[PDB]
């Protein structure tokens with residue numbers, strides 16, 4: 001299906017052999033600290049190592065200014081990248097934060113605003129030649145046709161990315177579940193996820209422990225592993241290449257079993 | 264989709280509103296005992312109650328002779344049925360065991376041999392007017408076309424059932440995952456499960472903690488919740504009306520989330 005590999009500098013990711021697991025890193029910051037403290041960064045590193053040991057293929061790291069956001073995240077990327085042999089993505093929508101994070105050692109950019117909040121981030125991406133995840137987002141829930149609108153919206157991000165020099169192969173899409181969508185809309189997007197495929201890019205799903213799962217099951221954030229699991233399984237069936245998750249152990253197993261079944 | 268309800272005597276099951284959960288009952292027998300002992304039956308009852316409390320819609324209860332099999336199972340059905348307001352299925356392929364179990368208070372018959380080991384069980388079913396689950400089974404793995412063969416095989420069971428007087432509405436099918444199939448064949452059957460639907464009957468999936476999950480994940484029986492989960496999710500996507508499971512709590516949540524998503 002994919003005639004290319006996601007090239008991530010020193011690491012290469014194969015889009016065909018298995019669903020790729022993106023682990024979500026704890027960023028619990030130290031009070032008293034601007035960033036880089038031993039407690040912050042060591043807690044971070046230990047979590048990255050755990051996620052690595054549990055089957056994570058990527059480590060995702062990401063109010064508050066840009067000056068600060070950098071002081072916070074840069075020390076973490078520097079440490080995790082040295083100590084965890086695994087590609088790193090920076091979870092930011094800010095061009096300068098993305099620039100700093102890549103200089104620090106991040107391999108992938110992860111923009112929850114699909115390059116629309118700071119189009120210059122697409123230029124950063126083009127320049128450094130790193131994959132960029134463009135997630136579906138908007139400031140309203142005023143759709144006329146959820147999926148058609150989503151696809152139009154995502155496609156507007158593809159345009160910004162390609163206009164900036166981003167190679168097709170460095171583009172990944174994200175339905176932006178839990179964003180700018182009612183609970184019912186999130187379920188509808190899940191139900192029709194396979195439609196994103198016609199756009200011709202790898203798809204990352206990010207549903208981990210989200211509010212719509214709590215809304216279906218009526219369970220708090222810490223009781224959402226089974227709901228996340230369902231969404232991950234459905235997502236894999238519908239052709240997604242990555243899943244962004246907190247529970248790396250559990251979701252790796254479900255993903256692996258799904259992979260085996262869908263052949 | 265279903266213009267009828269599964270009628271189970273005092274209980275009625277709706278095939279449309281949600282995936283129905285069949286909990287698998289522990290039958291840990293007492294040594295020294297022929298059956299009916301306080302420890303056996305109380306352990307059984309407590310488990311049925313737990314499964315009830317965890318979201319189970321049916322309680323499934325089932326070397327060794329027929330005389331004995333009855334002495335073992337009958338006391339359990341009598342107690343569980345009195346004390347757990349939930350339909351009960353007897354897991355047997357023996358006509359007389361099925362007869363005794365229904366007299367005891369079982370509502371559904373569950374035949375892993377699809378009425379081929381003891382065709383008279385279909386007559387028991389017709390007579391008492393209870394739903395019967397016909398599972399796919401055979402004494403060899405010598406297929407020419409797994410799915411086509413399976414469908415032919417299941418259909419041979421439908422014939423035995425209908426020839427005996429079994430109303431269409433009292434028929435449920437089961438792909439018989441983990442039976443007469445290599446690991447690779449089990450995965451293939453999972454992958455193509457939706458094909459069972461053309462037969463026009465409700466489908467029950469029974470994959471809980473099975474060996475093929477252990478074979479994909481390389482994990483022991485007690486470490487198979489995530490694998491079971493995957494198979495349950497896939498199965499629901501492919502149109503199954505029931506799932507037969509050990510982990511009632513966890514699988515109820517995954518099922519419920521799947522239901523919400525697939526609308």
Ligand SMILES: COC(=O)C[C@@H](C)c1n[nH]c2nc(N)[nH]c(=O)c2c1=O
Pocket residue numbers: 024091110111112133135174176177178204205206207244
């Ligand atoms: C730990 O989870 C979060 O930090 C919650 C939100 C803020 C979040 N951040 N970034 C994301 N990035 C992609 N690509 N897809 C997502 O669904 C997503 C999110 O849901």
Ligand SMILES: COC(=O)C[C@@H](C)c1n[nH]c2nc(N)[nH]c(=O)c2c1=O
Pocket residue numbers: 287354373374375396398437439440441467468469470507
């Ligand atoms: C606790 O699990 C078991 O007792 C293992 C086997 C023996 C088993 N018994 N009956 C079944 N009945 C239906 N309908 N579908 C099944 O997959 C199944 C089975 O897998």
